[PDB]
């Protein structure tokens, strides 16, 4: 076929053209994002039940919903947790490959049908089905710098005036408010309530009656009296709109004609829906939007758009209010793209320079410079076609493919240049011969690298999705690089290269070039003399190969494994937990301390801290809090001492000094939502109805034993919360019935006053908003106050709550996990250093096997995945190695010669492992893909030498050692050129520091260290490999 295009250069130009056009169009249209979606589809149900404890939530809501999650498809596991701020969350995790929209609507429909089985308060509140995404494009913070509006105000503003703006902004797929809009807060006073002999029940029924929508009908509605002339609507009562109105609600008319007014027993104000989170940004009140990028959207654009919209909102900001951007992935994605575009350009400047140094005519130096963009452009095409995005994974896979791309150009052009110098053939006859000499091998190389990278895409779950990115990027690049080298560069060679005289090896030139050429021709004799000696003595080299194979084996297992390196992301976070029973004030004082430390001791690095009192991973409560910390740029934080890993070490130490408060910091994972590749996720299950206390024991028993193998388990811990003192109040039915007091009166008085009670809606400023009745804090803080609430008896007397109740402390759970339907406790840990995850799990299973009967266990999370698809690697790589064999067998028409080539694989691996272990790096996906490419590329050179050698014997009848020495000579210059170019090309990634550099380091190191040894060792061992196998067979 490459003859076809040597005679038809236009045709081939058209194919180039078309490919470049498809490429450029894909470039305008491809989605840009940090990472693809890799986590499996998860759908989280959410509900709330104001004033309710974790048990009530579970027994009335969580069980009901879980009992109904039947008949949804491709469910992997369900899990829930129910807690003491009245929240529930139920996460259904679906098989990888589920339509999240089919999955979400199936969850949503069974829930709907379960909705009539829920508490009436919970029905009134609503239950939200959502696709689970820790993937945020950015988070816009909104703060008041002049102390004029509280956190609630800011939030309401943001709700009424900013949220929907952003929602409609292009490329924004979802938006979450960090706060509530206003709510009408009635803050009752029980002294007044008892003065006029009213209860929370009267207050509620008056708000339901005087804040109503009343349908009324029409004037002159069909069917009319014929001859009516007017048809008009009748508007009767609508919702109230102001606090002034609510305060003027009539409760009681007296015997006196006076009026008890809802302002006479309660304080009325707009406020938050909850007051459970205190949020601050550098000590000032704050709210914000969390913005997720929409499907297909471009991150760099959406971000700009979000910002654009924001600016045109600023003109109407009330005084004091300011925007802040404390989290934004787009600068990463910018740097990434700029850095990859950087690398890809330096790449062609390098092949320019190396091409000229050796071949020293400009005409040749064109042929790679055309061919490389053709393939890169046409790779974006195939990317788009397969529905891929421009992301960090696909971008570095572009970088891992440069070597294979570069090489295809260098190989074809140089072998035409060499056939010319050696045979004095015109460029059309010379390329036609040169193509005849690599045309089979080049196709062979395509099949073989296929059998390298294609298996990698077929890994399962989260990890398969990350390998799928590189697999498709890299196979595409190489496949067009073979197309372009059989279609485009043959044509280009035949029609751009100037001729070369027979024998003219450029040694007669002068200056730097003529010297180089004689120097190199001397070194090609130097080289072939050396290899000819090696070939007199194969044995010590077989012994050295075993030494190499053996060192690689050792370095493999002792190189620790991760799956993606952390980054200095610009951000990190800091947990603050406090004892059972610790108040919100107390947690704010710790967060205040934590906040002060960063703005004092880390002034140089820190730009901001965002202090959320009330929230955390393990749970929620007045006694927990997260600070979120946002740093200045990597170019204003010089050197590793101002890296996150530094700043966190320091801060964690500082905070271990804090009294009655566990406080620590830590970096964010490379890919949000994934957890340690050294970690396990353990679910401990009540399997025959033991109860909370029993499962708690079985846990601590499992946690004790775990601590008795520090050699194997480390950081083995519970994920939930510990039981806590709570106030049990019992209602005397007998005293109630006797006193004429309803227990529904009792339990709504109590529930409304101390827990809050959602009544109905009102319309503030054209916006519909909630109305809550609750006590003033002053009367709902301490067990002593229970005696200040009065409930009316039938006979109208006001009976103090104490007269029919009693009370005691017990312990109880403020959070309550479940898992696939049963009660559970989630245990977390990792394998102690030097030990693998599958081991720490084996032991964790056995330690459980000796637990009380009625206690079971399962594997969830990352662990669930690796348990099901952590076995595949040696399966897959087997088929890989089999096809690679099967292919080379067909290339060379020999069952034995394959081995000569295959034997090259340790030679690249070794230096990758060496360079890794040296720089402290890790066996992760960037390293592993780079292995794959280092193998593929040194495979490439092996396949060409053996081919040239086998040819020289097959066709020209040369003896084995003769053929092998000639082969290794002709292929020396191309191999040198590719590696020198490429090695230099991956240089900036190894040296790279600052922005987003762990990714570049991971790719760079292993590819360069694997290349130094793959280049050096191969040129000698490959002729060795070939002669031992030809001899043995």
């Amino acid at each position: 076929m490459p003859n076809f295009f040597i005679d038809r250069p236009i045709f081939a130009w058209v194919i180039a053209i078309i490919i470049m056009l498809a490429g450029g169009l894909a470039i305008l249209k491809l989605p840009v994002a940090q990472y693809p979606t890799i986590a499996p589809p998860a759908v989280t149900i959410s509900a709330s039940y104001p004033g309710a404890d974790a048990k009530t939530v579970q027994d009335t809501v969580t069980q009901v919903i879980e009992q109904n999650m039947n008949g949804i498809d491709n469910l992997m596991y369900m899990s829930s947790n129910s807690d003491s701020t009245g929240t529930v969350q139920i996460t259904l995790t679906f098989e990888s490959g589920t339509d999240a929209d089919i999955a979400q609507v199936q969850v949503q429909n069974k829930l709907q049908l379960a909705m009539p089985l829920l508490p009436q308060e919970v029905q009134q509140q609503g239950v939200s089905v959502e696709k689970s995404s820790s993937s945020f494009l950015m988070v816009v913070g909104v703060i008041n710098t002049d102390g004029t509006m509280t956190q609630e105000d800011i939030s309401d503003y943001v709700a009424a005036n900013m949220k929907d703006a952003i929602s409609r902004t292009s490329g924004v797929g979802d938006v979450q408010l960090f706060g509530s809009q206003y709510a009408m807060r009635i803050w009752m006073n029980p002294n007044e309530l008892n003065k006029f002999q009213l209860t929370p029940v009267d207050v509620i029924t008056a708000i339901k009656a005087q804040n109503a929508q009343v349908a009324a009908g029409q004037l002159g509605g069909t069917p009319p009296v014929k001859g009516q002339q007017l048809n008009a609507s009748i508007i009767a009562q609508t919702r109230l709109t102001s606090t002034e109105e609510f305060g003027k609600i009539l409760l009681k008319v007296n015997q006196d004609g006076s009026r008890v007014l809802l302002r006479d027993v309660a304080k009325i104000e707009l406020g938050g829906e909850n007051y459970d989170i205190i949020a601050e940004f550098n000590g000032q009140p704050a709210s914000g939007l969390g913005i997720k990028l929409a499907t297909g959207a471009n991150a760099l654009d959406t971000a700009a758009a979000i910002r654009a919209e924001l600016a045109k909102m600023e003109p109407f900001f009330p005084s004091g209010l300011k925007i802040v951007y404390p989290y934004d992935t787009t600068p990463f994605v910018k740097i990434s793209i700029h850095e990859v575009v950087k690398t890809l350009v330096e790449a062609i400047i390098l092949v320019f320079l190396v091409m000229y140094l050796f071949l020293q005519n400009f005409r040749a130096t064109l042929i790679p410079t055309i061919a490389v963009p053709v393939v890169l452009l046409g790779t974006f095409a195939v990317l788009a076609a397969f529905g891929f995005s421009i992301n960090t994974l696909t971008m570095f896979g572009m970088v891992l493919a440069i070597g294979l791309l570069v090489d295809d150009a260098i190989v074809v052009v140089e072998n035409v240049e060499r056939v010319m110098a050696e045979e004095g053939l015109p460029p059309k006859e010379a390329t036609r011969k040169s193509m005849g000499q690599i045309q089979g091998a080049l196709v062979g190389i395509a099949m073989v690298l296929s059998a390298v990278f294609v298996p990698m895409a077929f890994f399962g779950g989260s990890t398969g999705a990350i390998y799928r990115q590189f697999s498709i990027t890299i196979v595409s690049a190489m496949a067009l690089s073979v197309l372009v080298a059989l279609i485009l560069t043959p044509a280009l060679c035949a029609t751009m290269l100037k001729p070369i005289a027979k024998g003219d090896h450029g040694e007669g030139k002068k200056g730097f070039f003529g010297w180089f050429n004689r120097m190199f021709e001397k070194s090609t004799h130097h080289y072939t003399d050396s290899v000819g000696g090696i070939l007199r003595s194969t044995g010590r080299y077989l012994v050295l190969y075993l030494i190499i194979v053996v060192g690689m084996a050792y370095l493999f297992v002792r190189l620790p494994s991760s799956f993606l390196p952390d980054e200095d992301q610009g951000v990190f976070m800091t947990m603050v937990q406090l004892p059972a029973g610790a108040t919100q004030e107390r947690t704010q004082k710790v967060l205040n301390e934590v906040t002060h430390y960063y703005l004092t001791k880390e002034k140089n690095n820190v730009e901001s801290v965002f202090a959320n009192n009330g929230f955390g991973f393990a749970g929620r409560g007045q006694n927990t809090g997260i600070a979120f910390v946002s740093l200045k740029d990597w170019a204003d934080r010089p050197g590793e001492e101002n890296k996150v890993e530094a700043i966190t070490m320091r801060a964690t130490r500082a905070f271990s000094q804090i009294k009655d408060a566990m406080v620590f910091a830590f970096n964010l994972p490379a890919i949000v939502e994934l957890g340690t590749a050294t970690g396990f996720d353990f679910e401990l299950i009540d399997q025959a109805g033991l109860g909370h206390e029993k499962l708690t024991q079985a846990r601590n028993q499992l946690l004790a034993e775990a601590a008795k193998h520090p050699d194997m388990l480390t950081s083995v811990r519970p994920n939930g919360l510990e039981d806590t003192p709570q106030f049990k109040i019992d209602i005397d039915q007998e005293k109630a019935q006797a006193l004429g007091v309803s227990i529904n009166d009792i339990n709504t008085t109590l529930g409304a006053a101390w827990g809050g009670s959602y009544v109905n809606d009102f319309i503030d400023r054209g916006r519909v908003k909630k109305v809550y009745v609750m006590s003033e804090a002053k009367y709902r803080m301490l067990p002593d106050d229970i005696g200040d609430w009065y409930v009316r008896a039938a006979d109208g007397q006001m009976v103090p709550f104490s007269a029919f109740s009693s009370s005691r402390w017990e312990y109880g759970s403020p959070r309550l996990e479940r898992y696939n339907g049963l009660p559970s406790m989630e245990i977390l840990g990792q394998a102690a250093p030097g030990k693998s995850t599958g081991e720490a799990m084996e032991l964790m299973e056995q330690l459980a096997s000796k637990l009380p009967t009625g206690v079971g266990y399962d594997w969830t999370g990352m662990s669930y995945q690796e348990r099901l698809s952590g076995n595949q690697a040696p399966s897959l790589y087997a088929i890989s190695l089999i096809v690679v064999f099967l292919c080379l067998a067909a290339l060379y028409e020999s069952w034995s010669i394959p081995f000569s080539v295959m034997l090259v694989v340790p030679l690249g691996v070794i230096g990758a492992l060496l360079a890794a272990t040296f720089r402290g790096l890790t066996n992760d996906v960037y390293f592993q893909v780079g292995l794959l490419t280092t193998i593929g590329l040194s495979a490439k050179n092996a396949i060409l030498i053996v081919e040239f050698a086998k040819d020289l014997m097959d066709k020209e009848g040369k003896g084995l050692i003769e053929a092998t020495l000639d082969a290794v000579r002709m292929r020396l210059r191309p191999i040198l050129m590719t590696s020198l170019a490429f090695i230099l090309g991956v240089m900036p990634l190894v040296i790279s520091t600052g922005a987003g550099s762990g990714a570049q380091n991971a790719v760079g190191t292993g590819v360069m260290g694997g290349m130094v040894t793959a280049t050096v060792l191969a040129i000698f061992f490959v002729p060795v490999f070939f002669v031992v196998v030809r001899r043995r067979f």
Binding site: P579, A580, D732, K735, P783, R808
Partner: protein, 156 residues
């Protein structure tokens, strides 16, 4: 409050006897109370940790400590069925006729959860069986209402 007294409250609740032993070696506070008045004897008495109960009492723990609303470790023990702890506590001077702020007595609580042995022990050490709570119920009243006839018989 102290670093140790909180560590002791924790170990007392959790039943980590050697922690309690080491803690008692170091003069941690047997009178440390948590946020609601529970001392580690409370914690032990409630959570059913006999060893720690003894160790604490041996180390000067107050057997007749009372919480924010009057519960004595005997109250907890009688109520959650920890016969041996009941016996120890009463041996070590636990007021068997302690009334919490509801006028609830370890007899009441025991009658109520129906711990017949614990009833008789408490009666043995002199549980006033005609004691009444806030609402005038005697452990007998609890017994007839819960439908427990053996208990009813024991309280004659």
């Amino acid at each position: 409050g102290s670093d140790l007294g909180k560590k002791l409250l924790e170990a007392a609740r959790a039943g980590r006897d050697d922690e309690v032993r080491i803690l008692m070696a170091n003069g941690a506070d047997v009178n440390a109370a948590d946020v609601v008045g529970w001392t580690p004897l409370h914690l032990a008495a409630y959570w059913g940790h006999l060893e720690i109960v003894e160790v604490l009492l041996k180390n000067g723990a107050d057997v007749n400590a009372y919480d924010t609303l009057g519960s004595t470790p005997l109250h907890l023990a009688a109520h959650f069925g920890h016969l041996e702890i009941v016996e120890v506590l009463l041996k070590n001077g636990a007021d068997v006729n302690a009334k919490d702020d509801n006028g609830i007595t370890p007899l009441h609580l025991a009658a109520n959860r129906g711990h017949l042995e614990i009833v008789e022990v408490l009666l043995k050490y002199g549980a006033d069986v005609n004691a009444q709570d806030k609402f005038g119920k005697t452990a007998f009243d609890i017994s007839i209402n819960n439908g427990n006839e053996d208990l009813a018989e024991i309280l004659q």
